[PDB]
Amino acid sequence: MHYLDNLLLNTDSYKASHWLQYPPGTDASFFYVESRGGVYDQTAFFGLQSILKEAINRPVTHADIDDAKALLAAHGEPFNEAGWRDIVDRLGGQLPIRIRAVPEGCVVPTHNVLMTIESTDAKAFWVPSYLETLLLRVWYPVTVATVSWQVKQIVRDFLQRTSDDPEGQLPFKLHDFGARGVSSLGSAALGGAAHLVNFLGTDTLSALLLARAHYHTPVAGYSIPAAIVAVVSDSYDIYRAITTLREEIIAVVIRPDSGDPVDVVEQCLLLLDEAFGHQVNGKGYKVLNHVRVIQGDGINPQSLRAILERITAAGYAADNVAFGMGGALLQKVDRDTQKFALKCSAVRVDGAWIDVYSKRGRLTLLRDRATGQYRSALLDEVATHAGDSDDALVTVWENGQMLREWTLEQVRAHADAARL
Amino acid sequence: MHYLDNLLLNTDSYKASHWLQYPPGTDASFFYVESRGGVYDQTAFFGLQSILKEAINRPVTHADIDDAKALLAAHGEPFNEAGWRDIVDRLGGQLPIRIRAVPEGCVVPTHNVLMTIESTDAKAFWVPSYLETLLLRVWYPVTVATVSWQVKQIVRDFLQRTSDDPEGQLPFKLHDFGARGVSSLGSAALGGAAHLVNFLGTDTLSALLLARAHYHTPVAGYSIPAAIVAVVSDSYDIYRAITTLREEIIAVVIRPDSGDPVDVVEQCLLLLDEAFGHQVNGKGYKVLNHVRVIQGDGINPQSLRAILERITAAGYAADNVAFGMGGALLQKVDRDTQKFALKCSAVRVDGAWIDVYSKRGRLTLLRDRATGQYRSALLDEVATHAGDSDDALVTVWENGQMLREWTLEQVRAHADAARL
């Protein structure tokens, strides 16, 4: 809300005091963002566009400066009042930085440069450091998009072995139920949007608002009432049909919440097969008539795979089941899941660039044209050093103006094209 | 930001369709919030006041209804347009609900009623259900406040065995460095504020903005530049002093980030003792002269206790060291950490209350006057059933108006008074 609308106070307390730590006569500073490893060996990049639009949505003002100066003095931190007033009076309150990033949705192996931030004004060289806190939080939409993208690759494998329509079934196979279990409305919106990079099903209305506000997508995702109707049940209740109506369900998705996630799915399949029959698809796997099952409980990339391995062995196609994740998708991730870091790699002393500290200097990302494989390099080795690759970063933000910017449908295109 | 400013879309998709699921002729609905167990056996209650102020900050409008009606139809969910227009035209857009809660900061054992939500209009009985999603997220400030409060009890034990000034040293012994590692600015503000329920040190400027906006506290917490100055070092660097300046540090906190959290603290203590001496306090423990140590790395209630057990055995007072937590405090928690639930326990059929489903009916919380112990009971058994206890809940919100409401200094009073 409005009470957070001051970019000068959207940072760590010690970062306000940080401009005094630079050596004398420094003209510039260079930073980069990377994942230093963790659970997965690649990450789908997403979220930066939303973070820039929301966190940097207006010029800094003298009011912002008055408020920050006052709060931080009583808080115990020095504040560069004169440096910030210079930015407002001389630069119209526009942050003198350049941000380059891999196009959102692209899946990049770990230990690679994903974004770079460089200063564009000699006197306000310290501004990138000031923004470390709000930029580093990009770890969250990247990690959520990565978790979601890794689920997609698992489902896709099994929909490729079974199923006559793998890519037509895949977009509806992981549903977001995370709005209850996420830490804030803003995290529900951003993290839910990161899931929509990979799938179409979501119960996080907050994700539709962010995608339509930041990624130019009026309605990014769909759901059904709980025409396709989901009824919440329990494999014992379905077994008690031994009686009841059936046929008016022939003239349905079942969401269970009772039992081991792997088991109750297998039982629902065997019960609903007895109680609906099946067709045998072109790959030789059974597709239930009329009914499908969504396991929205205890779902994580491990139990996810266990369910699919188990129902595939039993002769049932992966078409029959879809999955739901809540807190395990939007909340049970952290900055160390993908070991995310924002590092300074270069400063300009004297008017001469020097490295900092194995990744040093002014850096970018290269994409090999033949193979599509990513590697990080120094900007001095892009052109006239590589007619075999192109610079993979694009300048998305500079000096207050957002340049390159994506629809959610472009983000999904990059992510859908990447495989493991 | 403004793009989230529609309470009708701050919910789960299926909850919009939820009013059709109630049996015919229902006049009311009763809900309650509790922790069903988890890591700890008690929880410090906090955050509801901020959630109400920010999520329910204005009357619902016909514009909200037009927007929700449109988005949800294209999304795939039914929407009670006529029910919401009734709320705006007949009730001024004020939510017909009553919310009662234990005063914030109070520490309540698990499996106890922490809040209740009851409808106050017969025709709009379904409104509490609509708000389940945004209310249940109270798990996050409660869990963060609980984690922080549990750290406090550990530090307090050791400051009671060592240290001549336990309660004067305790407020500065856990510092929040979580702004980098939390999932959103809003989570940084709310979760950081939950830490300030217990301590005064924070680097999360976002927490000061929320506390001054929602808990009437102009500056809730303090920090130091990194007069008390923190220098970031490394036990090997301190050992290389074997030379250098020392004395102008007599005319300092050391923040290390290299090595096992338990070890490097013990070494820094032994090195700085060699390199500064100590005084022996009234309890017989050594207090270093001039220098202190803050371990802001690898800190969790387990390694926290290990450090204190180790330095206490070595004869050093707990005054000598302070601690820092980042993602382990603000992000590495989830809804299952304290098994948080929002359950419906009573509906009104016919004009007659019936239970739902072991906790059923219209419920409240009692506090025994003699012992201060909490238990949950039915509202029908408060007065003329217990001259030995008082109803422990207070009505904080009703029909659009916030009633009882706290300063952060009142919240801290309740939490500081509770012990394990």
A137 touching chain B per CB within 8 A: yes
SS3 content of chain A, % helix, strand, coil (to 5): 40, 25, 40
Cα A305 off chain centre by: 21
Integer angstrom CA distances of residue A132 from A20, A78, A117, A305, B298: 16, 17, 10, 37, 21
Which residue among A9, A187, A206 sits closest to B10, beta carbon to beta carbon? A206
The dihedrals phi and psi of B280, each to the nearest 5 degrees, come to -95, 115
Listing from the earlier edge strand, what are the strands of the sheet with B352-355? B352-355, B340-349, B26-35, B113-119, B97-101, B394-398, B401-402
CA dihedral A366, A369, A371, A374 (to 10 degrees): 10
- Collect all residues of chain B within an 8 Å Cβ-Cβ radius of residue A180: 12, 132-133, 136-137, 335
Instruction: Name the region of B81 (left: φ>0; alpha: ψ -120 to 50; beta: rest).
Output: alpha
For residues B11 and A260, give the distance between their C-alpha atoms in angstroms, rounded to a whole number.
28
Q: Is B76 helix (H, G, I), strand (E, B) or coil?
A: coil
Q: Tell the residue number behind the tokens 């609900």, with chain if given.
A: B97
Query: Would you tell me how many other CB atoms lie within 10 Å of the CB of residue A171?
Result: 16
Which residue among A12, A183, A221 sits closest to B191, beta carbon to beta carbon? A183
| Residues constituting chain A | 420
For residues B340 and B143, give the distance between their C-alpha atoms in angstroms, rounded to a whole number.
9
A225 touching chain B per CB within 8 A: yes
B297 is in an annotated binding site: yes
Residue B174: which H helix or E strand, with range?
strand B174-176
Angle in degrees, 0-180, between the axes of helices A205-214 and A48-55, rounded to the nearest 10 = 80
Are the Cβ atoms of B74 and A139 closer than 8 angstroms?
A: no
Strand-pairing partners, residue A35, are A340
Integer angstrom CA distances of residue A23 from A27, A84, A246, A295: 10, 19, 77, 57
The ranges assigned to domains in chain B are 2-140+335-417, 143-330
**Binding site per annotation, positions of A for beta-nicotinamide D-ribonucleotide:** 203, 297, 335
DSSP strand pairing (B340-349 vs B352-355): antiparallel
Which residue among A187, A206, A326 sits closest to B187, beta carbon to beta carbon? A187
| DSSP 8-state secondary structure symbol assigned to residue B102 | P
For residues A403 and A365, give the distance between their C-alpha atoms in angstroms, rounded to a whole number.
18
Residue B254: which H helix or E strand, with range?
strand B253-256
Q: In this structure, which amino acid lies at residue A67?
A: D
For residues B155 and A38, give the distance between their C-alpha atoms in angstroms, rounded to a whole number.
32
Q: Which CATH architecture has domain B143-330?
A: Alpha-Beta Barrel (3.20)
For residues B393 and A58, give the distance between their C-alpha atoms in angstroms, rounded to a whole number.
43
| DSSP 8-state secondary structure symbol assigned to residue B4 | G
For residue A294, the distance in angstroms to the closest alpha carbon of chain B comes to 15
Opening angle at CA B89, ends B83 and B94, nearest 5: 80
The DSSP-derived string for B322-366 is EEEESHHHHTS--TTTTTEEEEEEEEEETTEEEE-----SSEEEE
Q: In this structure, which amino acid lies at residue B345?
A: S
- Collect all residues of chain B within an 8 Å Cβ-Cβ radius of residue A185: 4, 10, 55, 134, 137, 186
- Collect all residues of chain B within an 8 Å Cβ-Cβ radius of residue A206: 4, 9-10
Integer angstrom CA distances of residue A122 from A29, A80, A83, A127: 9, 15, 12, 10
Angle in degrees, 0-180, between the axes of helices A62-75 and A81-91, rounded to the nearest 10 = 170
Interface of B with A in 320-359 (CB under 8 A): 326-327, 331-336
- E strands, A290-419, in order: 292-295, 321-325, 340-349, 352-355, 363-368, 374-378, 389-391, 394-398, 401-402
The DSSP-derived string for A104-134 is TT-EEESSSEEEEEEE--STTTTHHHHTHHH
For residues B259 and B265, give the distance between their C-alpha atoms in angstroms, rounded to a whole number.
9
For residues A398 and A100, give the distance between their C-alpha atoms in angstroms, rounded to a whole number.
9
DSSP strand pairing (B174-176 vs A253-256): unpaired
Give residues after which chain B gaps, C-N over 2.5 angstroms.
226, 242, 251, 357
For residues A271 and B63, give the distance between their C-alpha atoms in angstroms, rounded to a whole number.
47
List, in order, residues 6 or more apart from A49 with CB less than 8 Å away: A104, A214, A215, A396, A402, A405, A406
Give residues after which chain A gaps, C-N over 2.5 angstroms.
226, 242, 251, 357
Nearest CA in chain B to A57: B1
Listing from the earlier edge strand, what are the strands of the sheet with A97-101? A352-355, A340-349, A26-35, A113-119, A97-101, A394-398, A401-402
Method used to determine the 3D structure: X-ray
Strand-pairing partners, residue A394, are A101
Integer angstrom CA distances of residue A278 from A273, A292, A404, B338: 6, 11, 49, 42
Which residue among B137, B183, B185 sits closest to A4, beta carbon to beta carbon? B185
Integer angstrom CA distances of residue A162 from A285, A306, A311, A314, B137: 6, 16, 11, 12, 39
For residues A348 and A351, give the distance between their C-alpha atoms in angstroms, rounded to a whole number.
6
Instruction: Name the region of B17 (left: φ>0; alpha: ψ -120 to 50; beta: rest).
Output: alpha
Strand-pairing partners, residue B109, are B42
Q: Kindly provide the resolution of this structure in angstroms, with one decimal.
A: 2.1
Q: In this structure, which amino acid lies at residue B187?
A: S
Tokens of A128: 């990138």
Tokens of B221: 């917490």
A136 touching chain B per CB within 8 A: yes
For residues A322 and A309, give the distance between their C-alpha atoms in angstroms, rounded to a whole number.
14
Alpha helices for A58-204 (secondary structure H):
62-75, 81-91, 127-130, 132-136, 139-161, 166-169, 185-196
Q: Is A151 helix (H, G, I), strand (E, B) or coil?
A: helix
Q: Is A411 helix (H, G, I), strand (E, B) or coil?
A: helix
| Contact predicate A16/A72, CB 8 Å | yes
Residue to test with chain A: of B8, B13, B14, B15, most A Cβ within 10 A = B13
Which residue among B9, B139, B223 sits closest to A13, beta carbon to beta carbon? B223
Residue A176: which H helix or E strand, with range?
strand A174-176
Q: Is the dihedral of CA A333, A334, A336, A340 positive or negative?
A: positive
For residues B369 and A14, give the distance between their C-alpha atoms in angstroms, rounded to a whole number.
45
Integer angstrom CA distances of residue B136 from B84, B130, B158, B411: 22, 11, 35, 20
Query: Diameter of chain A by CA atoms?
Result: 87
For residues A60 and A130, give the distance between their C-alpha atoms in angstroms, rounded to a whole number.
13
| Contact predicate B38/A245, CB 8 Å | no
The dihedrals phi and psi of B86, each to the nearest 5 degrees, come to -60, -45
Q: Is B195 helix (H, G, I), strand (E, B) or coil?
A: helix
The dihedrals phi and psi of B113, each to the nearest 5 degrees, come to -70, 120
A279 touching chain B per CB within 8 A: no
Are the Cβ atoms of B139 and A181 closer than 8 angstroms?
A: yes
For residues A327 and A330, give the distance between their C-alpha atoms in angstroms, rounded to a whole number.
5
B227 touching chain A per CB within 8 A: no
Cα A309 off chain centre by: 27
The DSSP-derived string for B379-407 is GGGSTTT-SSEEE--EEEEETTEE-S---
B419 is in an annotated binding site: no
For residues A319 and A60, give the distance between their C-alpha atoms in angstroms, rounded to a whole number.
52
Q: In this structure, which amino acid lies at residue B287?
A: V
Q: In this structure, which amino acid lies at residue A297?
A: D
Cα B59 off chain centre by: 27
| Contact predicate B326/B180, CB 8 Å | yes
Residue B417: which H helix or E strand, with range?
helix B408-417
Q: In this structure, which amino acid lies at residue A415?
A: A
For residue B236, the distance in angstroms to the closest alpha carbon of chain A comes to 18
Which residue among A9, A180, A219 sits closest to B74, beta carbon to beta carbon? A219
- The CATH T-level fold of domain B2-140+335-417 is nicotinate phosphoribosyltransferase (3.20.140)
The CATH superfamily of A2-137+339-415 is nicotinate phosphoribosyltransferase (3.20.140.10)
